[PDB]
Ligand binder design. Structure first.
Ligand code: 8DG
Ligand SMILES: OC[C@H]1O[C@@](CO)(O[C@H]2O[C@H](CO)[C@@H](O)[C@H](O)[C@H]2O)[C@@H](O)[C@@H]1O
Ligand code: MN
Ligand code: MN
Ligand code: MN
Length: 129
């Protein structure tokens, strides 16, 4: 069973909305809503990974961000450690830079069922802010 470290960014604007993308139909966790992010590569830190991943996926550079949550989740065929970074300041305007759907979603309207199950405690904690 493969083991991965994943860094993702919770991109929150001044109107309490989060920038959310939707995973491709042929990906792991296909068609699920997601915080943009990806695998932490050898030789880079979790902080460097969330910056690089957000630059690649949605075209922003996060800055002055914080670790909102770190958790582990065992999927049917892989074990993942997720680093959830709260990103409230950035350079750029997020968009579907890799051709993926992306949109702003009110925090209060997020439905954890739409996201991978690993995100459940994070979505709950976000609604408690
Ligand atoms: N990006 C992201 N991945 C999540 C979230 N919740 C969650 O369980 N995952 C899981 C799904 C995947 O198994 C893994 C994310 O890997 P990934 O597919 O984003 O990795 P990547 O972008 O570097 O891969 P690629 O585009 O280069 O093919 O973590 C989330 O909120 N955002
Ligand atoms: O780990 C993030 C945590 O560290 C602080 C400083 O105490 O922020 C630093 O680390 C961030 C991630 O690299 C940077 O964005 C930030 O500029 C740097 O000061 C806290 O603010 C944060 O909770
Ligand atoms: Mn990626
Ligand atoms: Mn990647
Ligand atoms: Mn990704």
């Amino acid at each position: 069973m493969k083991k991965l470290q994943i860094a993702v960014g919770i991109i929150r604007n001044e109107n309490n909305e989060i920038f959310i993308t939707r995973r491709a139909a042929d990906a792991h966790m296909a068609n699920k809503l997601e915080f943009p992010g990806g695998k932490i590569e050898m030789g880079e830190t979790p902080e460097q990974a969330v910056v690089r991943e957000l630059q690649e996926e949605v075209g922003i550079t996060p800055q002055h961000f914080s670790l909102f949550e770190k958790l582990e989740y065992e999927f049917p065929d892989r074990h993942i450690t997720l680093w959830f970074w709260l990103v409230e300041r950035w350079e750029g305007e997020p968009w579907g830079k890799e051709g993926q759907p992306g949109e702003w979603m009110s925090l209060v309207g997020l439905n954890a069922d739409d996201f991978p199950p690993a995100n459940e405690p994070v979505i709950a904690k976000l609604k408690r802010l």
